[PDB]
Amino acid sequence: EAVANLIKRIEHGEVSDEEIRGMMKIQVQKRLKWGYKPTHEQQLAQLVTFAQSLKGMEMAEEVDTLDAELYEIPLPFLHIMCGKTLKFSPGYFKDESTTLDESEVYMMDLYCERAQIKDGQSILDLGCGHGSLTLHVAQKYRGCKVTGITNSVSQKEFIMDQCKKLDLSNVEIILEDVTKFETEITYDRIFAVALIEHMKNYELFLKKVSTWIAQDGLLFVEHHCHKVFAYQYEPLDEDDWYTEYIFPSGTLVMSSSSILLYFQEDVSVVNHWTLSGKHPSLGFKQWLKRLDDNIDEVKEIFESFYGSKEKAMKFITYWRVFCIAHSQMYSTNNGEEWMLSQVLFKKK
Amino acid sequence: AVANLIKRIEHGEVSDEEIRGMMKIQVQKRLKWGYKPTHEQQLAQLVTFAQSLKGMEMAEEVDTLDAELYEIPLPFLHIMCGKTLKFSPGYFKDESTTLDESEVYMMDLYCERAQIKDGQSILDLGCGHGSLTLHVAQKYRGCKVTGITNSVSQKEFIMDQCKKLDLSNVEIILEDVTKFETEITYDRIFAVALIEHMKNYELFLKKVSTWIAQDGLLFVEHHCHKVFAYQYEPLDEDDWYTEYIFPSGTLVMSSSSILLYFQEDVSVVNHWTLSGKHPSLGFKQWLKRLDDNIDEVKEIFESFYGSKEKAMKFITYWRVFCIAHSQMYSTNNGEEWMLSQVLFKKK
Numbered sequence: 001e002a003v004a005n006l007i008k009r010i011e012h013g014e015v016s017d018e019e020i021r022g023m024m025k026i027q028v029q030k031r032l033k034w035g036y037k038p039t040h041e042q043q044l045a046q047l048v049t050f051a052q053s054l055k056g057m058e059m060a061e062e063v064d065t066l067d068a069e070l071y072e073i074p075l076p077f078l079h080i081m082c083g084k085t086l087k088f089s090p091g092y093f094k095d096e097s098t099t100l101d102e103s104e105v106y107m108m109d110l111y112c113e114r115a116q117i118k119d120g121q122s123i124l125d126l127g128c129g130h131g132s133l134t135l136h137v138a139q140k141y142r143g144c145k146v147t148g149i150t151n152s153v154s155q156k157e158f159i160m161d162q163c164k165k166l167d168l169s170n171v172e173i174i175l176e177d178v179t180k181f182e183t184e185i186t187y188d189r190i191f192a193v194a195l196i197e198h199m200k201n202y203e204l205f206l207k208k209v210s211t212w213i214a215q216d217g218l219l220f221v222e223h224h225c226h227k228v229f230a231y232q233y234e235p236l237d238e239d240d241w242y243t244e245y246i247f248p249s250g251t252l253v254m255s256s257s258s259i260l261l262y263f264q265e266d267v268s269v270v271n272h273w274t275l276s277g278k279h280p281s282l283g284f285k286q287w288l289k290r291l292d293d294n295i296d297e298v299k300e301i302f303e304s305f306y307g308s309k310e311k312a313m314k315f316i317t318y319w320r321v322f323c324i325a326h327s328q329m330y331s332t333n334n335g336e337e338w339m340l341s342q343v344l345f346k347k348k
Numbered sequence: 349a350v351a352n353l354i355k356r357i358e359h360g361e362v363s364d365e366e367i368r369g370m371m372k373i374q375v376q377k378r379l380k381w382g383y384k385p386t387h388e389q390q391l392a393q394l395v396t397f398a399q400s401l402k403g404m405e406m407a408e409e410v411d412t413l414d415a416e417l418y419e420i421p422l423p424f425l426h427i428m429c430g431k432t433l434k435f436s437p438g439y440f441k442d443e444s445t446t447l448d449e450s451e452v453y454m455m456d457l458y459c460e461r462a463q464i465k466d467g468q469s470i471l472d473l474g475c476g477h478g479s480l481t482l483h484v485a486q487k488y489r490g491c492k493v494t495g496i497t498n499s500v501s502q503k504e505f506i507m508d509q510c511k512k513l514d515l516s517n518v519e520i521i522l523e524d525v526t527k528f529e530t531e532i533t534y535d536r537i538f539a540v541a542l543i544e545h546m547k548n549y550e551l552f553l554k555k556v557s558t559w560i561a562q563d564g565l566l567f568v569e570h571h572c573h574k575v576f577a578y579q580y581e582p583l584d585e586d587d588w589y590t591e592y593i594f595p596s597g598t599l600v601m602s603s604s605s606i607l608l609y610f611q612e613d614v615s616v617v618n619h620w621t622l623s624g625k626h627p628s629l630g631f632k633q634w635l636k637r638l639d640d641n642i643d644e645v646k647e648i649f650e651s652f653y654g655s656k657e658k659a660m661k662f663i664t665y666w667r668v669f670c671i672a673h674s675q676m677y678s679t680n681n682g683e684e685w686m687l688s689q690v691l692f693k694k695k
């Protein structure tokens with residue numbers, strides 16, 4: 001296949017933004033045609049069969065050490081592309097004039113409302129990133145004790161540095177792989193925002209997390225999804241550049257909006273909401289605009305960090321393609337195909 | 349005007365093809381009521397509806413006066429229903445599958461999907477005239493099958509069949525399932541077309557869950573709309589269907605995913621749907637058998653109800669019920685109203 005040569009033309013910056021958008025529209029139509037079935041009997045069977053298949057998998061992929069480059073993101077680059085809180089997950093846009101910074105805070109206040117956060121609670125933020133929600137909650141609720149968990153040394157350093165600058169004493173960051181983490185502490189409220197996208201066996205994941213929920217505590221999960229069907233990211237045909245270009249070697253899963261309803265052995269659902277794909281679509285447009293508005297500094301950051309002009313171009317191109325393609329994907333059919341699912345769980 | 353039309357109905361004065369036309373109007377209004385322009389709104393409607401059920405009684409307690417709306421004479425059921433008297437849909441392999449075959453196909457599908465193994469203890473909640481109770485008891489002679497009904501005539505019929513068939517592995521308990529208490533547990537529990545009598549599914553599943561033995565399974569079949577749930581409230585002042593078909597006290601049309609929100613005490617193991625073509629085809633067969641035997645049906649109803657007029661009223665009711673619901677379940681190739689089967693384990 002000449003997928004390899006198309007990918008090399010992408011990596012050298014030879015493929016226009018509109019061509020990328022058009023390529024993604026084709027990929028979207030292929031995936032929708034693959035996933036939709038003529039009868040509900042078949043549609044449901046496909047989802048239940050998929051859910052059952054996850055129950056025999058590992059909780060998550062062991063990331064190859066050689067693929068560290070695909071996971072570490074330079075902080076100066078995130079300061080440019082992301083909003084002020086470095087949220088690595090969608091914002092909430094009240095309209096198309098909402099700013100990226102506003103969208104981050106709007107969404108995090110929505111999390112606090114839907115997760116029923118109250119001052120004084122113990123809070124666990126699983127996969128806390130650069131601390132957008134951990135620091136949001138810790139600043140808002142000075143009586144809360146907030147614990148964040150991340151497997152990234154540089155993320156933990158950044159958050160503890162922010163705690164110093166913001167004079168917060170109510171934040172702890174644990175450096176651990178959440179899939180191996182052993183604790184007997186229970187928490188009043190647990191957040192798992194954009195963490196499920198790293199997992200495969202949701203059953204094993206939620207079993208482990210359920211042991212960390214206190215009596216009468218709650219677990220709030222946000223996952224991006226397709227409205228109807230779930231799938232592993234595998235090439236649809238011999239022409240599939242998307243799966244090869246965007247994702248690392250290991251196999252990951254696109255959830256559906258209902259799939260966690262089938263994983264209620266150890267937690268049970270209190271509430272379940274969705275938000276339109278328009279919100280992530282707008283977010284990725286703002287990420288791309290910020291990248292382009294600061295392209296000279298982005299180049300200097302990546303040339304410095306990655307060690308050559310060629311490899312820098314490859315990674316700048318990757319992030320631009322990622323924003324372009326996923327802005328297009330989430331926009332599909334006025335935001336009613338790919339979207340966001342939020343689930344509130346109680347223990348047992 | 350609706351009360352006038354209903355009185356026209358109860359006397360038998362409007363033909364069949366326009367009963368379908370009127371139901372198609374009703375269908376279009378319900379679908380327009382239920383569907384929302386966004387998934388956010390559609391889901392919120394379902395979650396809100398599910399929460400509303402948790403503020404209700406488990407089931408309406410049935411009064412003295414209204415026994416006429418629930419007692420169905422056995423000779424009539426022998427005419428209308430298939431050979432097992434299944435009062436729930438059959439499975440049609442094609443449109444030439446007979447009513448009798450559809451009953452057995454569907455009950456073998458229940459046995460497959462509920463993972464019945466010979467020797468298990470089996471509980472059949474709301475067993476009716478015993479279609480599944482007697483099917484399982486004869487197919488799996490090492491099983492002990494217990495059926496629960498609140499109907500004396502149903503219990504009497506089943507026990508008569510056990511005598512005729514020399515079945516020694518069946519027990520029928522005459523009890524209100526919503527009040528029943530026992531220390532016995534069961535490897536397999538069936539609830540086929542029972543939750544359509546329930547409102548607070550959370551209380552219902554909480555009670556049933558205590559009856560599930562270690563590593564046992566509960567199998568629920570409910571008719572439903574694919575997407576949204578609703579109470580049988582009239583849609584406007586031109587809705588005759590809701591007033592005509594349903595008794596006082598409100599019942600619930602479930603949605604295909606609604607029991608996924610009721611997993612406090614049981615956990616979903618599997619979940620299937622079958623299209624509305626199956627119940628649609630079954631109601632057509634019920635209607636055909638009624639019509640082909642109408643003089644005998646008149647004889648049975650005149651004896652039981654006491655007059656030609658009242659017999660005609662109840663005959664008309666059953667015909668309209670079959671016509672209207674064959675039309676309803678056929679909507680959009682059976683992709684609106686349909687059947688949901690859910691397999692639960694104890695949580």
Ligand SMILES: Nc1ncnc2c1ncn2[C@@H]1O[C@H](CSCC[C@H](N)C(=O)O)[C@@H](O)[C@H]1O
Pocket residue numbers: 060086087088089126127128129130131132133149150151152155176177178179192193194195198
């Ligand atoms: N096994 C694992 N253990 C711990 N953290 C993990 C992990 N797999 C992924 N993560 C972390 O999960 C996060 C997903 S990105 C989202 C971060 C944050 N929830 C936000 O919304 O901004 C990243 O911080 C990643 O480092």
Ligand SMILES: Nc1ncnc2c1ncn2[C@@H]1O[C@H](CSCC[C@H](N)C(=O)O)[C@@H](O)[C@H]1O
Pocket residue numbers: 407433434435436473474475476477478479480496497498499502523524525526539540541542545
């Ligand atoms: N509270 C209650 N206690 C016991 N039986 C009940 C009940 N409410 C309804 N039922 C019974 O539940 C049945 C619903 S009809 C279904 C009968 C059988 N499952 C079949 O598929 O043929 C009726 O037999 C009715 O008598």
Ligand SMILES: COc1ccc(C[C@@H]2NCCc3cc(OC)c(OC)cc32)cc1OC
Pocket residue numbers: 070071072073087088089090091194197224280283284322
């Ligand atoms: C649905 O909206 C979004 C979907 C995905 C994202 C980014 C996505 N999730 C977090 C982990 C993660 C990690 C990645 O590698 C470090 C990554 O590479 C593109 C992408 C992602 C961000 C989103 O909003 C900003």
Ligand SMILES: COc1ccc(C[C@@H]2NCCc3cc(OC)c(OC)cc32)cc1OC
Pocket residue numbers: 417418419420434435436437438541544571627630669
């Ligand atoms: C979806 O397919 C069906 C739907 C409803 C039915 C009939 C419905 N369910 C059982 C209890 C029941 C009891 C009734 O009165 C005692 C009744 O009167 C119409 C109707 C019903 C029968 C069905 O198939 C035969």
Ligand SMILES: COc1ccc(C[C@H]2NCCc3cc(OC)c(OC)cc32)cc1OC
Pocket residue numbers: 069070071197198244245246247248252314315318
């Ligand atoms: C769990 O979600 C993800 C986790 C990791 C990744 C890998 C991705 N991380 C950012 C940088 C980068 C650069 C690449 O090559 C320049 C590349 O090539 C494959 C992949 C990546 C993607 C994810 O979802 C899209």
Ligand SMILES: COc1ccc(C[C@H]2NCCc3cc(OC)c(OC)cc32)cc1OC
Pocket residue numbers: 416417418544545591592593594595599661662665
């Ligand atoms: C639980 O599901 C049901 C239970 C009971 C009923 C009531 C119904 N039973 C059969 C005979 C009959 C006759 C009537 O008037 C001649 C009548 O008028 C309203 C209603 C009925 C309907 C149900 O679902 C449609």
